[model samples]
Target: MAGGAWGRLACYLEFLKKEELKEFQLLLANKAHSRSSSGETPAQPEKTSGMEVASYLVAQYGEQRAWDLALHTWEQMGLRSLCAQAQEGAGHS
Candidate 1:
């Protein structure tokens, strides 16, 4: 259910309303990274970027909650122990 919710939320965020798109554009321009670790430029606005959103959520909602949410999401997809590995990855970064 949590994974489904996250997926739905992500879809909704992707196709944000016009006003929301404006806000997302502003946030991306002001806050998101233009280039990723792989040196690839992001095609979407900042708020729609998973890394940016994850960083924001981690900072605002605390690392554990963010990790737990991610874990649950992954678990729902049947990636059993992947969440634990993801949690470790989150901590090291």
Candidate 2:
């Protein structure tokens, strides 16, 4: 199993080792947040991880940006506990 959607997505980072991944990240970043509802921050994909949240923040920036994003998100949400909880919570299901 490639694991959950986020994990699966992250796995492909290896494939993007060249300029390929960053190129798409630019495209996706432009398109992804467009799905946002006005000014509201989007909800976390169900049963996913802070890592995934952070990782997906910007494809070009990779997981480091994702981690900072997640930390800020959890901080704003008062979800420090969830920060440490199951990353791929749905993997078992």
Highest TM-score model number:
1
lDDT of each: 0.43, 0.41
lDDT of 1 at 75: 43
RMSD per candidate (Å) reads: 13.9, 12.7
Clash numbers, per candidate: 0, 2
Tens-place lDDT per residue, model 2, 8-71, is 4444243333343333333333344335655334443322333343345544344554444444
lDDT of 1 by residue, 2-87 (tens): 34124333333343354443443344333323335553223543444543454454554455554455444444445454544444
Per-residue lDDT, model 1, residue 93, is 24
Q: How many clashes (backbone atoms < 3 Å, residues ≥3 apart in a chain or on different chains) does model 2 have?
A: 2
lDDT of model 1, residue 34: 37
lDDT of 1 at 63: 58
Specify the poorest-scoring 10-residue window by lDDT in model 1.
Answer: 4-13
Candidate 1 Cα outliers beyond 4 Å, as residue runs: 1-46, 87-93
Model 1, TM vs. native: 0.35
